[PDB]
Amino acid sequence: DRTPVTLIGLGPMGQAMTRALLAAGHPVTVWNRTPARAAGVVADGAVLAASPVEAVEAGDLVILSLTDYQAMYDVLEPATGSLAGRTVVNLSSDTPDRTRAAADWATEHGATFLTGGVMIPAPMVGTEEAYVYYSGPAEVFEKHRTTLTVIGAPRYLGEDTGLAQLMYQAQLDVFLTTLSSLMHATALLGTAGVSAAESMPELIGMLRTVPAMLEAPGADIDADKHPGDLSTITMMGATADHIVGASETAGIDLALPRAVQAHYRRAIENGHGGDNWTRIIDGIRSP
Amino acid sequence: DRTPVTLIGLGPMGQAMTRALLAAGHPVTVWNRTPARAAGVVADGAVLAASPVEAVEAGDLVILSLTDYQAMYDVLEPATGSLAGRTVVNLSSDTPDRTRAAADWATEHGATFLTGGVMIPAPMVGTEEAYVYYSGPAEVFEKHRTTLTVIGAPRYLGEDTGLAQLMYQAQLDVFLTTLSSLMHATALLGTAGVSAAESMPELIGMLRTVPAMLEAPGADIDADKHPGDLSTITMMGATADHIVGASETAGIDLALPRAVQAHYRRAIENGHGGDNWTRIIDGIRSP
Ligand SMILES: NC(=O)c1ccc[n+]([C@@H]2O[C@H](COP(=O)([O-])OP(=O)(O)OC[C@H]3O[C@@H](n4cnc5c(N)ncnc54)[C@H](OP(=O)(O)O)[C@@H]3O)[C@@H](O)[C@H]2O)c1
Numbered sequence: 001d002r003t004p005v006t007l008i009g010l011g012p013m014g015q016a017m018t019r020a021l022l023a024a025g026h027p028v029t030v031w032n033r034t035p036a037r038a039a040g041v042v043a044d045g046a047v048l049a050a051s052p053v054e055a056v057e058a059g060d061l062v063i064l065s066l067t068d069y070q071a072m073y074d075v076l077e078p079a080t081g082s083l084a085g086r087t088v089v090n091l092s093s094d095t096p097d098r099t100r101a102a103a104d105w106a107t108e109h110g111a112t113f114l115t116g117g118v119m120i121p122a123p124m125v126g127t128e129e130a131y132v133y134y135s136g137p138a139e140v141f142e143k144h145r146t147t148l149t150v151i152g153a154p155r156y157l158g159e160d161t162g163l164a165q166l167m168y169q170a171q172l173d174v175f176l177t178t179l180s181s182l183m184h185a186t187a188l189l190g191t192a193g194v195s196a197a198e199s200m201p202e203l204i205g206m207l208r209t210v211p212a213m214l215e216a217p218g219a220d221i222d223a224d225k226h227p228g229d230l231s232t233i234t235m236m237g238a239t240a241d242h243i244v245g246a247s248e249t250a251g252i253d254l255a256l257p258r259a260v261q262a263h264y265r266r267a268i269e270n271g272h273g274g275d276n277w278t279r280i281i282d283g284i285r286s287p
Numbered sequence: 288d289r290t291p292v293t294l295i296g297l298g299p300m301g302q303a304m305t306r307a308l309l310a311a312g313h314p315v316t317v318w319n320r321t322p323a324r325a326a327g328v329v330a331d332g333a334v335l336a337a338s339p340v341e342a343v344e345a346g347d348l349v350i351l352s353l354t355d356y357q358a359m360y361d362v363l364e365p366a367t368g369s370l371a372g373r374t375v376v377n378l379s380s381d382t383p384d385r386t387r388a389a390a391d392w393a394t395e396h397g398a399t400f401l402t403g404g405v406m407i408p409a410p411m412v413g414t415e416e417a418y419v420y421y422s423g424p425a426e427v428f429e430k431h432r433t434t435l436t437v438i439g440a441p442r443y444l445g446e447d448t449g450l451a452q453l454m455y456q457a458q459l460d461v462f463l464t465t466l467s468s469l470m471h472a473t474a475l476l477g478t479a480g481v482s483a484a485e486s487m488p489e490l491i492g493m494l495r496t497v498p499a500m501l502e503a504p505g506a507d508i509d510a511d512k513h514p515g516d517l518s519t520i521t522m523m524g525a526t527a528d529h530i531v532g533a534s535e536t537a538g539i540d541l542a543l544p545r546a547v548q549a550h551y552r553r554a555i556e557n558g559h560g561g562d563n564w565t566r567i568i569d570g571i572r573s574p
């Protein structure tokens with residue numbers, strides 16, 4: 001379609017999403033707290049609205065790409081009288097319960113609301129590897145599906161506005177924790193004079209094979225199948241201890257490896273040392 | 288090659304390494320704290336030594352596959368008089384400084400010592416995807432290299448007996464932390480009724496693309512290049528906050544997400560909110 005889209009928030013993601021939408025033939029009206037930041041997308045065909053009200057009134061679809069949901073309230077408060085009959089799609093990080101309350105806030109101002117969690121960095125927006133989680137009213141998703149698909153293949157999760165946000169937080173839980181561990185291991189090796197340039201390829205090389213190493217688990221966790229034939233919590237917990245020890249001696253952050261160590265210690269304390277590592281999920285669920 | 292090899296410790300890794308060595312034509316003499324556990328490898332051609340001394344005396348190469356280095360002292364103490372002239376290869380998890388002291392202990396008993404860290408699970412032992420870090424005397428590595436290659440491609444790191452162990456701990460830092468985060472995210476989604484069988488493929492699907500998403504870092508960390516064009520610590524820190532918040536509300540472990548949150552808080556506190564996420568390594572290095 002060539003339906004008009006409004007996009008508020010021109011960080012790298014809003015800029016990429018704007019460009020994707022322009023390339024696909026949508027007129028895009030933008031607004032940004034910092035108008036100078038819109039110069040690039042305006043040169044590429046975006047229209048810079050002078051005020052939030054003007055931006056909101058430009059289209060029946062308002063996409064938000066902001067750091068958090070407080071930013072949505074900040075920018076849309078002067079425009080709440082212009083929301084009726086439009087769909088707000090918030091593509092921003094926050095808690096699921098912030099998101100759920102925001103959806104009701106939209107309804108109160110006469111708008112529909114969809115939650116989106118964009119699952120790739122800005123350069124990958126609008127490519128074949130892009131995808132976005134969505135949740136909220138099915139009818140509102142279907143209405144805008146074809147426009148939204150320009151950004152990334154949609155994965156609709158259902159009616160709960162919180163759910164796409166929960167999926168995003170869970171995905172970023174894995175992503176951010178993995179990244180922190182890469183920096184932690186890089187730091188640890190750096191302590192014996194190993195370059196990050198030497199370290200990081202070794203660590204990434206291993207990380208690339210992790211899905212495979214795991215398959216050499218979801219249903220098993222659901223089925224309580226935690227058998228320790230090829231790797232026990234005892235043995236992995238010992239390695240967790242060795243990492244804490246090495247970290248202590250290296251003088252680097254202890255909080256991250258200690259959180260991991262605790263997952264194993266809890267499982268052993270509860271009498272499941274002989275089980276597979278998936279067993280640590282029980283202590284995680286019940287601190 | 289057909290050099291005789293002794294392997295002590297018949298967990299899944301010792302069993303796999305024994306079988307790989309037998310398949311490649313090496314006579315393998317085994318000993319285990321629990322002799323019944325050797326029935327399988329003996330059926331496949333291994334010789335079960337009655338005592339640790341007998342096992343050590345069977346060959347010039349003694350491989351240890353035990354949960355930690357204390358286990359090495361436990362099993363080899365009765366046999367310290369039979370170590371002279373032989374090479375101990377310890378393929379067990381422990382701290383780098385435990386490893387370094389153990390190497391000197393071997394030297395005092397007239398043996399040579401090599402550190403190894405086996406980087407794949409037991410089913411992948413002896414396959415084209417297997418690899419093992421080694422460190423210790425170059426001459427001792429060269430002497431046994433062709434036997435050791437049966438287990439996996441060697442990656443020799445140099446003379447410091449601690450270094451292959453530090454590499455192993457840094458690798459398992461990433462691997463265990465990644466796994467903990469998978470279980471953490473699985474738990475978080477399970478809190479809204481999402482199955483692990485539904486959750487885990489979504490999480491793995493994302494994890495598979497992490498090397499790619501990163502390239503869409505080592506030399507930059509070495510060069511202090513931490514520019515926040517496409518993703519800032521401010522923005523990623525906010526998501527870390529949202530994960531903590533979602534975790535609080537879900538009633539799951541807070542220690543793991545809080546350790547990640549702290550990486551970001553520290554960087555912002557030190558005035559680097561505008562930087563790329565790699566900047567968290569500075570606070571990690573200086574707790
Ligand atoms: N970058 C990524 O790779 C990536 C990937 C997927 C998801 N995300 C998510 O996408 C969203 C946008 O991220 P991003 O990296 O593009 O950018 P960002 O650094 O979060 O900035 C996005 C926009 O937020 C605006 N903003 C922040 N606080 C505001 C406030 N209180 N009032 C008004 N405007 C406010 C900024 O305004 P100014 O321009 O005036 O500073 C900017 O336009 C975030 O929720 C993030 O978690 C990011």
Ligand SMILES: NC(=O)c1ccc[n+]([C@@H]2O[C@H](COP(=O)([O-])OP(=O)(O)OC[C@H]3O[C@@H](n4cnc5c(N)ncnc54)[C@H](OP(=O)(O)O)[C@@H]3O)[C@@H](O)[C@H]2O)c1
Pocket residue numbers: 230231232235239295296297298299300301319320321324352353354355357358361362378379380405406407408409
């Ligand atoms: N499993 C993997 O996927 C994997 C991958 C790479 C590296 N590793 C490392 O490889 C090593 C072996 O791990 P694994 O999973 O094969 O097995 P494991 O569960 O660590 O057990 C290995 C052996 O240790 C013995 N043992 C432990 N404590 C002992 C003690 N105090 N005295 C004597 N024997 C003792 C056990 O004796 P019993 O048989 O009598 O119980 C068993 O034979 C570990 O250091 C682990 O970190 C494991």
